Design a protein around this ligand. Structure first.
Ligand SMILES: Oc1cccc2cnccc12
Length: 113
């Protein structure tokens, strides 16, 4: 029970804060299938921050869970695909940790709406 425009402004700010935590920009764009040919073998729904931005602007995120679930896919896909001893796996752990605090604060703000 809130107005659409302030909520989308909040999601835009939140997405920018999450992208800031991905300092290597390894999640900024879809995983390039041309360089990872086996990626889709067990990754059923790829996700990335650019796709999240397009979903946001297409009005596909109307509650915080819609938005947070796609963020969680970025993390979980990366933990699934990559071995634990890789920078990519550890980057997803770091993003989960640093991004979780960003998400908790942003969800508090949405609940004031
Ligand atoms: O090759 C990649 C490039 C950027 C991100 C990736 C996330 N998981 C597996 C592979 C990736």
């Amino acid at each position: 029970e809130m107005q659409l425009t302030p909520f989308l402004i909040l999601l835009r700010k939140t997405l920018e804060q999450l992208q800031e935590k991905d300092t290597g920009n390894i999640f900024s764009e879809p995983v390039p299938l041309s360089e990872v040919p086996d990626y889709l073998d067990h990754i059923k729904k790829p996700m990335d921050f650019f796709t999240m931005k397009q979903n946001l602007e297409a009005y596909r995120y109307l509650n915080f869970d819609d938005f947070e679930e796609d963020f969680n896919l970025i993390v979980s896909n990366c933990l699934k695909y990559n071995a634990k001893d890789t920078i990519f796996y550890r980057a997803a752990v770091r993003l989960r940790e640093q991004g979780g605090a960003v998400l908790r604060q942003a969800r508090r703000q949405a609940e004031k709406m």
